[PDB]
Amino acid sequence: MTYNVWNFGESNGRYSALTARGISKETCQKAGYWIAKVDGVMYQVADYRDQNGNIVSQKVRDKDKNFKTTGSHKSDALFGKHLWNGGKKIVVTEGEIDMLTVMELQDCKYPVVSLGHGASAAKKTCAANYEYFDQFEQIILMFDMDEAGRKAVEEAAQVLPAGKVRVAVLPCKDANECHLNGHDREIMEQVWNAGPWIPDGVVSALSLRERIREHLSSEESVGLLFSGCTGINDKTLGARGGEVIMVTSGSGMVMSTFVRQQALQWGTAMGKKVGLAMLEESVEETAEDLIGLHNRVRLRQSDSLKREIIENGKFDQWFDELFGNDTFHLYDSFETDRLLAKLAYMRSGLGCDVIILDHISIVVSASGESDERKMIDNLMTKLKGFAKSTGVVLVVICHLKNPDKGKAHEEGRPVSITDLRGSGALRQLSDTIIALERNQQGDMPNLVLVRILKCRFTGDTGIAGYMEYNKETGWLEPSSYSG
Amino acid sequence: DHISIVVSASGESDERKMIDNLMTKLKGFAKSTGVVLVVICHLKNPDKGKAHEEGRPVSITDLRGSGALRQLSDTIIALERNQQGDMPNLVLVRILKCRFTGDTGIAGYMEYNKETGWLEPSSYSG
Amino acid sequence: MTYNVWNFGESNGRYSALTARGISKETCQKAGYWIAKVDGVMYQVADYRDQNGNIVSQKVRDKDKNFKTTGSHKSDALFGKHLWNGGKKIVVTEGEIDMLTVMELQDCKYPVVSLGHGASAAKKTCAANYEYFDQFEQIILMFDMDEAGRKAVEEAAQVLPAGKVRVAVLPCKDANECHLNGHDREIMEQVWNAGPWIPDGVVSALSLRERIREHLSSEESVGLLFSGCTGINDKTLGARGGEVIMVTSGSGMVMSTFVRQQALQWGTAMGKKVGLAMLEESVEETAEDLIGLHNRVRLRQSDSLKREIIENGKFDQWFDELFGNDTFHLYDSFETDRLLAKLAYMRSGLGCDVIILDHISIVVSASGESDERKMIDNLMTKLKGFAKSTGVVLVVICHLKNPDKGKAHEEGRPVSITDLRGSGALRQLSDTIIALERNQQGDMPNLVLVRILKCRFTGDTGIAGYMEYNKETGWLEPSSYSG
C-alpha cells in the first residue's frame, strides 16, 4: 500500500512559526503547515486536504532540501484548497511557502492556495480544478518570476476559466523572496489589481495604430491598372497583389488577347516582372505574339513580315527592345501539384509579381480521378493560397461552358456568375471577375463588352466599358460607347 | 464574421456536421455569458433559376448548415440585393426569425452609397 | 462447410439418465437427449430432427455452461418436433431440459417440443411452424416465469394460430425448477386445462358499461370553447378531451399568440389546469408573456413598464392574480421519449386537462437517425396515444414548410392539408386542424383568417372567422368580416 498519512502527535508535531521565512506561527496554523520530528530528524509537513476537510496527502520536508510525500497526492492537489469555497479573488502561488506568505500579508483573510505539483504540472493541476477555481471572480496567478515560471503561468491560464486570470508580477523570484526583507507592498499591489491576460491573438484596436499607419502607406489601393478600358479600373481599382483576377468569356481569343495586352504593358510601362504560363501554346509562340503585339503588327500571322525582320535586323532589335529587361518569364510545358510548384518558383525565385495562368480548364497529370467539376475547385484553392500566401498577382483565364439556352456566345449573350464554369471554387476564391462578351455576328462584330462580374475590394460591379478588336494591329483598343 | 470558416483540427468529415458543433459552443458562450453574439454567415447557391445577385429572396430552408444555426440562432436577419436591376444599390431586409418576438418578415430597405460606403436607410414599400 | 452432425458412437454416446434434473434414462432416450464424450470431456447432446425423422442439427453442452451447435439449426427448429404429427394438445417449452420434464411427468405419452432458439427467437421459431402447430387442437405455451419469459409468450402467441394458445403458469422459473423437488402436480394442473389467455386489447362491449358511463359524465360535446372567434367553436364544437388539436400557419407568431391566448382563457375563465411545453422559449419568458397578455399590456416588450410594476407592487399583484390558482404549469427545458414522459406526468401527476406543445418541429435528443419527415410521424403517434389513452386535450402547434409557389405566407396564401408539413402522421392523427393565415403586407396586415382544415368530431370545415392583431394589447381580438 501507499505511504500512510502522517499523524500529528504520532510524529512530534508543533505548529511553530517559520522564523526563516517571516511566516508567523498563527499563519502556519491555519493553512496546515506543521513541524513534526520522526526517528530523530525534524521535518516540515504540509497538509493537503480536499474541499471536504479530510487530509488526503502530505508533502514533508527535511532541512537539506529533500522530500517525502504521504497519502495519495492526486493530480488535482491544491494546498490551502479546503480553506476557501468561493470568493471574489483567489491568489494561486507556485509553492507552499509562498502561499503561507500571501496568507500573512493578508492576515489570512483571503484566499490563497498553492499548486500541488506546482512547477511543471501547472497545466494538469489547474485544469483538474476548473470548477473549484470558477468559484471565484478572478484567479490571480502569482508564480515564479523566471524562465519556467512565466511558462507555468502561460500553460496555466490556457486551461483556466475565461477572462478571470490575471498574472502577478513581483520584483523577485517569488512572493516570499519579496517578503524576506524587501517589498511586502509590492506583493500587495498585485493581490489587489494584478495584470490580467494571456490573449495570443486577441488584439485591442487601440493597439494597432502603428500597424495600420504603416499598412496605409505600404499597401495599395490602386494596384496595377488594367489596360485598354478605364472602367475595368474605375470599377475594380486594379489588380492588387495577392488577389486572384479571373478573366472569362465566350469563344474569346478576345480573352487570350486581353490577358496578353495586360502582361505586355505591365511588364513594360510598369516595372513589374510578369510570369506567364500560357498552357495552350508553346513558349516560343507566346513570345512572338508578345513582340508583334508590342509592335502593333500581327507577327506570327504573316509569312512576309517574319522573313523581313529576321533579315533587316529588326527582329533582334524589337526583341531586345521588349524583352531585354529580364521582365518577362514563361513556364514552358509538355500535374496540378507539379505546375503549382513551377508557378511558385516564378514568384519566389525569379520574383515576378504577376503570374498569368492561361486557361485553367487545362488541369493535367495524375489520372485515376473523376469530375473536372470537383478538381477544378481543388486547384482553384491551391491557387488562391499561392496568391494570398505570397502576394503575387494571379490573373487566371477561364473558358465558359456552353448554354443550351437559345443564343450562343458569338451571339453576344451576356454572362453571369451562375453562367460560370467550375462548381463554386472560382465563383468564390477569385477576387475580381472580368468577363468579356463579343457578339461576333452583329452590328459591331469587333465590339466587345466588359462586365465586372465581381470585385471584393470594391464591390462596384457591372458593365464597365467597351473595347474594339483591331484585326489589323492585334490590340484590344478602348472604345467610345454606351446607351 | 463569417462562420463558414471553421479552422484547425483536420481529419474530419462534413462541414455540414461540424458547422453545427461550433454553432452550439457559440450559442453556449452566448447564453452562458450574456454577451451579444452577431454571427455572419454566407449562403449556399441555389441550383434554382435566379441567383443571388438576381435578388432572389432567402428562406430558412434556403439556409446553410444542417440545422444548428437554423435553430440555435435567436434572430436571423437576411439581406437581399438584386445587383442587376432597377435598384442595384437597393437592399431588402427579411427578418427570418426572432425568438423574443416572432414578429418576422420584410422589415425595411436600405441603399448602398458607393460613395460614402454606408448602408443608408431608404424610403420604400409596395 | 458447416459443423458436422455428431455421430452416436463416433462420440462415446450413452442414453443415460439426467440424475441432476429428475429426468429418467428412458426419457432422454425418446426425445433424443444423449450423453457423448469427445477428446476427453463429456458433452450433453440434444438431437434436433425434422418431421421426417432425419437429424438436421445438434445442440451440445459441456459442464461449465457452454455450447456447440452441430448441423444446420434452421430458423424453425423445434426439439421433439419429430415425435408428434398431430394431437389434441401440445406443450411448448422454452428449453430442451424442460421438454424432458413434461415428457416425464407424462410418461412420454403426449406431445412436448422445445423452442429451437427459445428465449429471444420466440416469435420467429414459432411463426416458422404455424402449420406444424395447427396440427394440434390447443397449443400450451409453458415458457419461463420471468420478465423476458412472459414477453416470449406474448410474441409467440401473436404469430401462433387463432384461439388455440393457452399460457402455462408455474410456481417457479421453469417447468424443471418445479420438478426438481417441488410441485410436479402444479405442472400437471397446467398441461391439462391451464390458462387460455391472449386478449390484451380486445374488449367486449358489455364489459365497457362502467368505462362508458364515467366517460359520458366527464367529457363534454362542447369540450372547451376556443376563444376569440366563435366560428372556431361553431365549426369544431370545441376541444374535446383525448383529441389532438393542431394549430398551424405561416410565420405566424399570430399562431403562438393564438395558442397562448387559449391557454390563458382555459386556465382562468374555465377551471381547467393548463400545462405548457413551450419548447422555443424559457419558462420565465412564457410566464411573462402570459401575465402581460392577461393584463392586456405588452409586458416583456417594454423596459419602462417592467420596472414600473416591479416597484409599484403591481407585479406581485398581477402574478398572484393570474397564477395563484395552481392552474398553469410549464415544462422547462435545456429526447422524444424523454419529453413525452414529462408531458405524461403533467397529465397524470399534476392532472392538467390541456397540454399545449409549442412547436412540434422541434423533435430533440437521440442523434444517429434520418428524415425529420419520418420521425415527425413517430412522435405524432406517441402523442395521439398519450391523448386518447389519457383524455388530456393536446393542442400541438406546428409550423409550415415554404411554398416554392409564387405567393409566400406573409402574402396571405391560404393553406391546405396538402400544404401540410410532416409526411402524413399529423395530416392523419390530429383530430381538429386549425390554420391561421395572415397577409402581413396588404389591406389588413393585422387581419388574420382562420381555416378549419379538419375536424373529425364534426367534419364541418372551412373558413371559420377572422381576428385582428392588436399590436398594442398583444391580443388576437375577434373581428367583423366576410364577403
In three state form, how does the secondary structure of chain A look? CCCCCCCECCECCECCCECCCCECHHHHHHHCEEECCECCECCEEEEEECCCCCEEEEEEEECCCEEEEEECCCCCCEECHHHCCCEEEEEEECCHHHHHHHHHHCCCCCCEEEECCCCCCHHHHHHCCHHHHHCEEEEEEECCCCHHHHHHHHHHHHHCCHHHEEECCCCCCCHHHHHCCCCHHHHHHHHCCCECCCCCCCCCHHHHHHHHHHHHHHCCCCCCCCCCCCCHHHHHCCCCCCCEEEEEECCCCHHHHHHHHHHHHHCCCCCCCEEEEECCCCHHHHHHHHHHHHCCCCCCCCHHHHHHHHHCCHHHHHHHHHHCCCCEEEECCCCCHHHHHHHHHHHHCCCCCEEEEECCCCCCCCCCCCCHHHHHHHHHHHHHHHHHHHCCEEEEEEECCCCCCCCCCCCCCCCCCCCCCCCCHHHHHCCEEEEEEECCCCCCCCEEEEEEEEECCCCCCEEEEEEEECCCCCCEEEECCCC
Return the residue in B45, B79, B83, B115 with the most chain A beta carbons within 10 A, the one to mutate for interface testing.
Answer: B45
**Cβ neighbours for C340, distance < 8 A, ≥ 6 positions apart:** C379, C382, C383, C386
Asked if residue C333 lies in contact with residue C279, where contact means CB atoms within 8 angstroms, the answer is yes
| C-beta neighbour count of A342 within 10 angstroms | 16
State the Cα–Cα distance between residues C252 and C438, nearest whole angstrom: 8
> Quick check: is C40 in a domain?
yes
Q: Which letter, b or e, does each residue of A217-233 get, where b requires 16 or more Cβ atoms within 10 Å of its Cβ?
A: eeeeeebbbbbbbebbb
Q: At what angle do helices A303-311 and A314-323 cross, to 10 degrees?
A: 90
Residue C283 and residue C375 share a domain: yes
Residue A84 and residue A103 share a domain: yes
> Quick check: is C2 in a domain?
no
Residue C151 and residue C79 share a domain: yes
State the Cα–Cα distance between residues A192 and A168, nearest whole angstrom: 10
State the Cα–Cα distance between residues A460 and C6, nearest whole angstrom: 87
**CA-closest candidate to residue C78, choices C118, C107, C28:** C118
State the Cα–Cα distance between residues A294 and A268, nearest whole angstrom: 10
Which residues 165-194 in chain C show a CB within 8 A of chain B? Answer: none
- Sign for the CA dihedral angle at A102, A108, A113, A119 comes to positive
State the Cα–Cα distance between residues A237 and C70, nearest whole angstrom: 84
Compare all CA atoms of chain A with the CA of B50 and give the residue at the minimum distance.
Answer: A418
Interface check C410 vs B, CB under 8 A: yes
Residue C195 and residue C217 share a domain: no
Show the CA angle centred on residue A429, arms to residues A428 and A430, nearest 5°: 95
Interface check B105 vs C, CB under 8 A: yes
Instruction: Provide the H-helix boundaries in C280-335.
Output: 283-294, 303-311, 314-323
How many domains are contained in chain C?
2
Interface check B103 vs C, CB under 8 A: yes
**CA-closest candidate to residue A3, choices A41, A42, A79, A59:** A59
> How buried is residue C181: exposed, middle or buried, by Cβ count under 10 Å (0-12/13-18/19+)?
exposed
| C-beta neighbour count of A411 within 10 angstroms | 15
Show the CA angle centred on residue A172, arms to residues A168 and A174, nearest 5°: 60
Eight-class DSSP state of C401: P
C441/B104 touch (CB, cutoff 8 Å), yes or no: no
Q: Which of B45, B54, B114 sits opposite A460 (nearest CB)?
A: B114
Tell me the C-alpha to C-alpha distance, in Å, between residue C363 and each of C160, C359, C422: 37, 9, 12
| Residue A269: CATH number of its domain | 3.40.50.300
Residue A282 and residue A335 share a domain: yes
Show the CA angle centred on residue C106, arms to residues C103 and C107, nearest 5°: 80
State the Cα–Cα distance between residues A42 and A12, nearest whole angstrom: 9
**Cβ neighbours for A104, distance < 8 A, ≥ 6 positions apart:** A22, A23, A24, A27, A179
Boundary (domain end) residue, out of C157, C176, C202: C202
Residue C264 and residue C190 share a domain: no
Q: Which three cell numbers stand for residue C168?
A: 402455462
Count how many Cα atoms sit within 13 Å of the Cα of residue C35 in the half-sphere of its side chain: 12
Strands of the C33-35 sheet, one edge to the other: C33-35, C44-49, C55-62, C66-71
State the Cα–Cα distance between residues A132 and A126, nearest whole angstrom: 10
Asked if residue C223 lies in contact with residue C238, where contact means CB atoms within 8 angstroms, the answer is yes
**CA-closest candidate to residue A156, choices A108, A123, A112, A184:** A123
> Quick check: is C30 in a domain?
yes
Q: Where are the beta strands (DSSP E) in C381-474?
A: 393-399, 432-438, 447-455, 462-469
Long-range contact list for A294-302, CB < 8 A, 24+ apart?
Answer: A294/A264, A294/A268, A294/A318, A294/A321, A294/A322, A296/A473, A296/A474, A296/A475, A297/A473, A297/A474, A298/A472, A298/A473, A298/A474, A301/A474
Count how many Cα atoms sit within 13 Å of the Cα of residue B54 in the half-sphere of its side chain: 12
State the Cα–Cα distance between residues C123 and C143, nearest whole angstrom: 13
- Sign for the CA dihedral angle at A299, A302, A306, A309 comes to negative
State the Cα–Cα distance between residues A227 and A83, nearest whole angstrom: 76
B83/A462 touch (CB, cutoff 8 Å), yes or no: yes
| C-beta neighbour count of C180 within 10 angstroms | 14
Q: Which domain holds residue A136?
A: 1-200
Interface check A162 vs B, CB under 8 A: yes
Nearest 5°: phi and psi at C256? -65, -15
β C78-79/C112-115 pair status: antiparallel
Q: Which three cell numbers stand for residue A229?
A: 478600358
Residue C141 and residue C212 share a domain: no
Compare all CA atoms of chain B with the CA of A459 and give the residue at the minimum distance.
Answer: B114
Number of CB pairs < 8 Å for A and B?
15
State the Cα–Cα distance between residues C176 and C170, nearest whole angstrom: 10
**CA-closest candidate to residue C373, choices C361, C356, C386, C365:** C361
Interface check B108 vs A, CB under 8 A: no
State the Cα–Cα distance between residues A30 and A100, nearest whole angstrom: 9
Boundary (domain end) residue, out of A156, A175, A200: A200
Boundary (domain end) residue, out of C202, C235, C270: C202
Residue C165 and residue C18 share a domain: yes
Resolution in A: 3.5
State the Cα–Cα distance between residues A382 and A287, nearest whole angstrom: 27
Q: Which three cell numbers stand for residue A336?
A: 496540378
Q: Is C142 helix (H, G, I), strand (E, B) or coil?
A: strand
Asked if residue A168 lies in contact with residue A156, where contact means CB atoms within 8 angstroms, the answer is no
Q: At what angle do helices A254-266 and A283-294 cross, to 10 degrees?
A: 70
β C476-479/A55-62 pair status: unpaired
Q: Which three cell numbers stand for residue C37?
A: 464424450
Chains A and B touch (3+ CB pairs under 8 A): yes
- Note the maximum CA span of chain A: 116
Strands of the A136-142 sheet, one edge to the other: A78-79, A112-115, A87-93, A136-142, A165-167
Q: Which three cell numbers stand for residue C270?
A: 374555465
Chain A closest CA to B88's CA: distance in Å?
10
Eight-class DSSP state of C104: H
Residue A211 and residue A148 share a domain: no
Nearest 5°: phi and psi at A373? -45, -60
- Looking up cell 502522517, which residue turns up? A6
Q: Which three cell numbers stand for residue A210?
A: 502603428
Nearest 5°: phi and psi at C18? -80, 90
Q: Is C388 helix (H, G, I), strand (E, B) or coil?
A: helix
Torsion angle (degrees, nearest 10) of CA A413, A416, A420, A424: -170
Residue C169 and residue C300 share a domain: no
Tell me the C-alpha to C-alpha distance, in Å, between residue A441 and each of A412, A448, A469, B85, C386: 8, 12, 14, 27, 73
Which chain B residues touch C440 with a CB distance below 8 Å? 105
Asked if residue B7 lies in contact with residue B18, where contact means CB atoms within 8 angstroms, the answer is no
| C-beta neighbour count of A200 within 10 angstroms | 8
What length does chain B have?
126
Tell me the C-alpha to C-alpha distance, in Å, between residue C443 and each of B105, B126, C415, C439: 16, 11, 19, 8
Q: Which letter, b or e, does each residue of C397-431 get, where b requires 16 or more Cβ atoms within 10 Å of its Cβ?
A: bbbbeeeeeeebbbbbbebebebbbbeebbbebbb
C253/B100 touch (CB, cutoff 8 Å), yes or no: no
Residue A163 and residue A38 share a domain: yes
What is the separation of C-alpha C265 from the centre of its chain, rounded to a whole number of angstroms? 32
Q: Which of A416, A460, A462 sits opposite B51 (nearest CB)?
A: A416
Asked if residue A350 lies in contact with residue A320, where contact means CB atoms within 8 angstroms, the answer is no
State the Cα–Cα distance between residues C229 and C464, nearest whole angstrom: 8
Interface check A207 vs B, CB under 8 A: no
**CA-closest candidate to residue C125, choices C76, C59, C56, C69:** C76
Q: Is C92 helix (H, G, I), strand (E, B) or coil?
A: strand
State the Cα–Cα distance between residues A145 and A174, nearest whole angstrom: 6
Nearest 5°: phi and psi at A310? -60, -45
Q: Is C225 helix (H, G, I), strand (E, B) or coil?
A: coil
The two counts, helices (H) then strands (E), for chain B are 2, 4
Eight-class DSSP state of C365: S
Residue C247 and residue C125 share a domain: no
Q: Which three cell numbers stand for residue B119?
A: 448602408
Q: Which three cell numbers stand for residue C480?
A: 367583423
State the Cα–Cα distance between residues A253 and A250, nearest whole angstrom: 9
β C393-399/A274-278 pair status: unpaired
State the Cα–Cα distance between residues A168 and C70, nearest whole angstrom: 76
Q: Which three cell numbers stand for residue A398?
A: 477561364
